[PDB]
Amino acid sequence: AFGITTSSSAYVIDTNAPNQLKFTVSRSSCDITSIIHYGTELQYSSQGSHIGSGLGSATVTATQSGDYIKVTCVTDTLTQYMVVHNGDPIIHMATYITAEPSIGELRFIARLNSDLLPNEEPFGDVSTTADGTAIEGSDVFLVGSETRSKFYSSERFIDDQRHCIAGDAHRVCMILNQYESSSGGPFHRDINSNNGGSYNALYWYMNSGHVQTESYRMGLHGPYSMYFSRSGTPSTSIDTSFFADLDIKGYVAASGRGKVAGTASGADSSMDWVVHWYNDAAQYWTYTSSSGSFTSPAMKPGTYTMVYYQGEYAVATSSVTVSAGSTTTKNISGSVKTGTTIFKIGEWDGQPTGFRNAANQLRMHPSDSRMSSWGPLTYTVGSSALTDFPMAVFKSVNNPVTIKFTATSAQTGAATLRIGTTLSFAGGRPQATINSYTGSAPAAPTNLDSRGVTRGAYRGLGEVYDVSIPSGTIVAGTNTITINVISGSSGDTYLSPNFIFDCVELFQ
Ligand SMILES: [Ca+2]
């Protein structure tokens, strides 16, 4: 029956779902210590499913409110909520924090039986590290001759509404429709799952220091929902509005929110467009339609910075204020301006899309034998394909990148060489030489203090470096550009200073 079974050590919650879903919550730690779905135990027996690596000790309460049951777990700076609805095989959750956990990241981890749930969705075994030997830190491994990492299960948050682990008789998915308290914007990605050898972990990283570009946000994170199925795959359309009636700390209901609607215009129509709003309390985003129209998700009231991107490249920024129960009409427009182009490598989309190894880099390590050669490579404009230009240059692997190009007598005037990047590591930035002219050495970029290119990520601060080329330096005929990555830091192979390319353009 739908209900709560109380024992001195735990509360057992029965959702009364058709295919059965009951779970046990420790009254001492708030760990989920047992999960029974369709008569089968799914929880790893040696360590619980919980926030972080466990709350350790929490004050736990459980109550029924109509067709809902709420379990609340209070600690000094974090309150964890689990809510179930009679008849649904779902553990809905929300996590309220007044300070970031001591570890410096906020995650929920379900440690589930890997014999029953061996697979990872939607990316497969790229994040299966079971039987692997570490090749980088304790997070990238070699399984046979293939590189693997929990990071290779990652996805851009704007596109990560569902990820799961599964087997032939059970599937467990996270349904994520509320990233407002996370950090890093729509293009932040993070660890989603990892079959590591003892169990298969299913995660929601609410925030972390993994290629983090923003400060953390306090308040209520989520809701998020963990759905249990036999062989079905749940839709991401899951109503969690009932949280409004459960006195959930930090929960702002639909009635307390407003929206921003308008039309974005001017950017590159060959790219997807995204509008993003943020302030110290919350972040929101939406794709626009092909006509540029958009409507924001329901937003907490306040004043926000508003950004318009083509791909992940910001073309315009503005400010807007939202009030509860109202829609603020606000358009936004802009475009990427350069000049008369002599040559262009890649596109201004804030990504290394199209470059050599870019697709593989999201799902394997740069040292994987399946990667194409990193170089040093020579790209010749007019002959080389974009997949011959390295997605990244590392001071101690493929430095420098050489570009050869032909100019006409009409192109020998002053020009600007623009080297756009997405993410730096260990102070890497470009210094360019054009024929016998060397540009100045830029200062080191802001250090994000995080591995990234070796862990399937590329969304950094997007530093762009311009080099002014005087008239008469470009010559009619063949010209040579050398891009060296410079830095006072050092590292072994892919951990040497480096940066990922966005686009290189020479214009006048
Ligand atoms: Ca690009």
Number of structural domains in the chain: 3
Give the H/E segment covering residue 482.
strand 477-486
CA of 421 to the centre of ligand 1 (A): 8
Amino acid at 162: R
The b-or-e profile of 381-398 (16+ CB within 10 A means b, else e) is: beebeeebbbbbbbbebb
CA distance 504 to 402: 12
Burial 254-278 (b: 16+ CB within 10 A, else e): eeebbbbebbbbbbbeebebbbbbb
Token pair 């949280």: residue: 243
Resolution limit in angstroms? 1.5
User: How far apart are the CA of 413 and the centre of ligand 1, in A?
Assistant: 26
Domain termination site, one of 316, 336, 356 = 336
Strands 332-333 and 259-265: parallel
Residue 33 CA, ligand 1 centroid: distance in Å: 46
The terminus-to-terminus CA distance of the chain in angstroms comes to: 74
Question: What is the distance in A from the centroid of ligand 1 to the CA of 293?
Answer: 24
Q: How far is the CA of 55 from the centre of ligand 1 (A)?
A: 42
Dihedral sign, Cα of residue 337, residue 187, residue 138, residue 75: positive
Which residues make beta-bridge pairs with 379? 403
Helix (H, G, I), strand (E, B) or coil at 360: helix
Ligand 1 centroid–CA 497 distance in Å is 20
Q: Ligand 1: distance of its center to the CA of 382 in Å?
A: 18
Using DSSP, state whether 93 is helix, strand or coil.
Answer: strand
CA–CA distance, 161 with 335 (Å, rounded to integer): 29
Q: What's the gap in Å between 336 CA and the centre of ligand 1?
A: 12
Structure tokens at 255: 């009635």
Cα 214 to Cα 338: distance, rounded to the nearest angstrom: 28
The two three-digit tokens of residue 178, written as one number: 């509320």
Cβ-contact 417, 506 below 8 angstroms: yes
> Ligand 1 centre from 163 Cα, in Å?
27
User: Ligand 1: distance of its center to the CA of 348 in Å?
Assistant: 5
Q: Can you tell me whether residue 22 is helix, strand or coil? A: strand
Contact assessment for residue 480 and residue 434, using Cβ atoms and an 8 Å cutoff = yes
Two tokens at 393? 């240059």
Ligand 1 centroid–CA 354 distance in Å is 8
Share in percent of the chain as helix, strand, coil (round to 5): 5, 45, 50
Cα-to-centroid distance, 465 and ligand 1 (Å): 14
Dihedral sign for Cα 430, 434, 436, 439, please: negative
DSSP secondary structure string, 311-329?
A: TTEEEEEEEEEE-TT-EEE
* Nearest-angstrom CA–CA distance, 406 and 124: 44
- Minimal CA–CA distance to 363: which of 108, 117, 122? 122
**Are residues 341 and 466 both part of a single domain?**
yes
Written as six digits, the tokens of 431 are: 């210094």
Q: What is the Cα–Cα distance from 81 to 13, expressed in whole angstroms?
A: 13
Token couple for 53: 């690596």
What's the CA-to-centroid distance between 146 and ligand 1, angstroms?
27
Ligand 1 centroid–CA 197 distance in Å is 37
Going from the Cα of 503 to the center of ligand 1, the distance in angstroms, rounded, reads 5
Q: How far is CA 503 from CA 27, 29, 32, 347, 445, in A?
A: 54, 50, 47, 5, 18
CA atoms within 13 A on the CB side of 161: 10
Provide the strand spans (E) within 7-161. 10-14, 21-26, 32-37, 40-41, 50-51, 59-65, 68-74, 78-85, 90-97, 106-112, 119-121, 133-136, 140-143, 146-149
CB hemisphere CA count around 193 (13 angstroms) = 30
The amino acid that residue 18 corresponds to is P
- Pick from 311, 309, 256: nearest CA to 278: 309
Please identify, among 336, 358, 374, the residue that sits at the C-terminal boundary of a domain.
Answer: 336
Give CA–CA dist 289/122, Å, rounded. 25
b/e sequence 401-423, b meaning 16+ C-beta within 10 Å: bbbebebeeebbeebebbbbbbb
Any residues with CB less than 8 A from the CB of 310 and at least 6 apart, and which?
A: 267, 268, 271, 272, 273, 336, 348, 349
CA of 422 to the centre of ligand 1 (A): 8
119 to each of 22, 133, 168, 368, how far by Cα in Å? 23, 20, 9, 22
**Is 223 found in the same domain as 284?**
no
Residue 67 sits in the same domain as residue 212: yes
Q: Based on the fold, state whether residues 306 and 346 are members of the same structural domain.
A: no
Q: Which of 122, 12, 27 is nearest to 72 (CA)?
A: 27
Whole-number Å distance between alpha carbons of 454 and 110: 25
CATH of the domain at 218: 2.70.98.10
Does 264 lie in the same domain as 216?
no
Q: What was the elucidation method? A: X-ray
Contact criterion met (CB below 8 Å) for 323 and 301: yes
Whether residue 95 is found in the same domain as residue 243: yes
Give residues with Cβ within 8 angstroms of 266, minimum separation 6.
Answer: 315, 316, 333, 334, 335
Token duo for residue 265? 């215009």
For residue 270 the two structure tokens come to 């060959």
**CA 286 to ligand 1 center in whole angstroms:** 21
Strand order in the sheet with 283-287: 283-287, 273-278, 302-310, 313-322
Does 210 share its domain with 350? no
Encoding tokens for residue 445? 């970029």
Task: Note whether 325 and 342 are same-domain residues.
Answer: no
DSSP result, 251-293 = ---GGG-BEEEEEEESS-TTS-EEEEEE-SS-EEEEE--TT-E
If you measure from the C-alpha of residue 349 to the centroid of ligand 1, how many angstroms do you get, rounded to a whole number? 5
Beta strands in 311-461 (DSSP E): 313-322, 327-329, 332-333, 341-346, 378-380, 392-394, 401-407, 415-425, 429-434, 437-438
DSSP codes, 199-235: -EEEEEEEE-STT--S----EEEEEEEEEEESS----
Unique residue bearing structure tokens 């919980």: 50
* Alpha carbons 21 and 228: distance in angstroms, whole number: 8
Residues 289 and 268 in one domain: yes
Structure tokens at 199: 């169990």
Q: Does 278 share its domain with 208?
A: no
Token readout for 223 is 């809701």
DSSP annotation of 43: B
What distance lies between CA 160 and its chain's CA centroid? 8
How many Å apart are CA 373 and CA 379, to the nearest integer?
13
Nearest to 151 by CA among 118, 127, 125, 131: 127
39 and 186 co-located in one domain: yes
Choosing from 230, 251, 272, the residue where a domain stops is 251
Strands (E), 426-459: 429-434, 437-438
232 and 294 together in one domain: no
The CATH number for 394's domain is 2.60.120.260
Boundaries of domain holding 329: 252-336
As given in the structure block, the two tokens for residue 416 are 């600007």
Question: How does DSSP classify residue 454?
Answer: G
Residues by chain with Cβ below 5 Å of ion ligand 1: 346-347, 349, 351, 502-503
The rounded Å distance from CA 501 to ligand 1 centre is 7
Contact between 500 and 453 under an 8 Å Cβ cutoff? The reply is yes
Dist. CA 458–CA 215, nearest whole Å: 18
Three-class secondary structure of residue 244 per DSSP: helix
SS3 at position 294: strand
Kindly report the CATH number assigned to the domain that includes residue 264. 2.60.40.1120
